[PDB]
Symmetry: C3
Subunit: 121 residues, 3 copies
């Protein structure tokens, strides 16, 4: 049975330095053939804003965008906490980039129980 790694991202662009590592780690994990998921919450959802990502892609040089894309290429599954998205980040569900599963906080409990190990950032 394949082992499962969950990575929790709780910072946004206000602290970008804390957002690179987790996504690079997600690619590393995936490359080692672990089924790897990332869960965005608290300010994490701001990293998934369509307009912010488009801005950063156009500017270039954003390491979060680089590692986000690498994680996606490596098959990393991604989730965003809707209570964080709406109530903490003041985003709409439609503001989230495609391919991220919108879930409630209960899903974090399920995902951490289902994973072999969870990393918190």
């Amino acid at each position: 049975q394949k082992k499962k790694i969950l990575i929790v991202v709780t910072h946004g662009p206000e602290d970008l330095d804390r957002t690179y590592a987790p996504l690079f780690m997600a690619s590393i994990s995936a490359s080692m053939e672990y089924e790897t998921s990332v869960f965005f919450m608290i300010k994490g959802p701001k990293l998934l804003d369509k307009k912010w990502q488009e801005e950063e892609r156009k500017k270039g040089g954003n390491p979060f965008i680089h590692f986000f894309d690498m994680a996606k290429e490596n098959g990393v599954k991604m989730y965003v906490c809707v209570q964080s998205l709406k109530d903490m980040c003041h985003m709409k569900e439609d503001d989230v980039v495609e391919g991220i599963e919108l879930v409630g906080g209960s899903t974090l409990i399920d995902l951490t129980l289902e994973a072999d190990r969870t990393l918190f950032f």
Copy 2:
């Protein structure tokens, strides 16, 4: 056998945004019938100060207070690291709101080993 969830809170009012989520998560966990505990340390103990909580209750509108109370209503067990309380936060043991167990740091090691999963904030 009932499963056990531990949530570690390491921020205080200096970063309130990082304190809501963990306590909301504790209520969610409890509502799913997991035995749920919260462990306050580093600046976390400041959230448990009697005078601060009374101030915030009187002002209203503090989401930490809301989620703290909900967690308590849902039977969430709470612990505070005495070394953090005294040496980091400069609080007295008597400054802690009632119903929180005052423990040493060794207890975090026991609690994380005894829990099925631990969440870190």
Copy 3:
């Protein structure tokens, strides 16, 4: 079989308050006869800079240095993420204090899987 505790340190001197606890925790864990390791990453590697540590030892009074030394006396194994060291912290490998194992990020995945429990700071 002896149980294994891993502690992850992600802050540096920019947030010293978040660096004391983890190292004190590492000594506590070791004193309880758990095989204990600390993994430094993100800004954590700055805590391991030779010149910074020498400065702080000469000034005195730095609690991180105190708890770092206690952890070492208690046999705590230490690792530093080379991608963090170089790319986030702009340090050279030679800038790291002796006795820390320089490793890639894949090693965090191995270490967290091999440990019974992991603490994240």
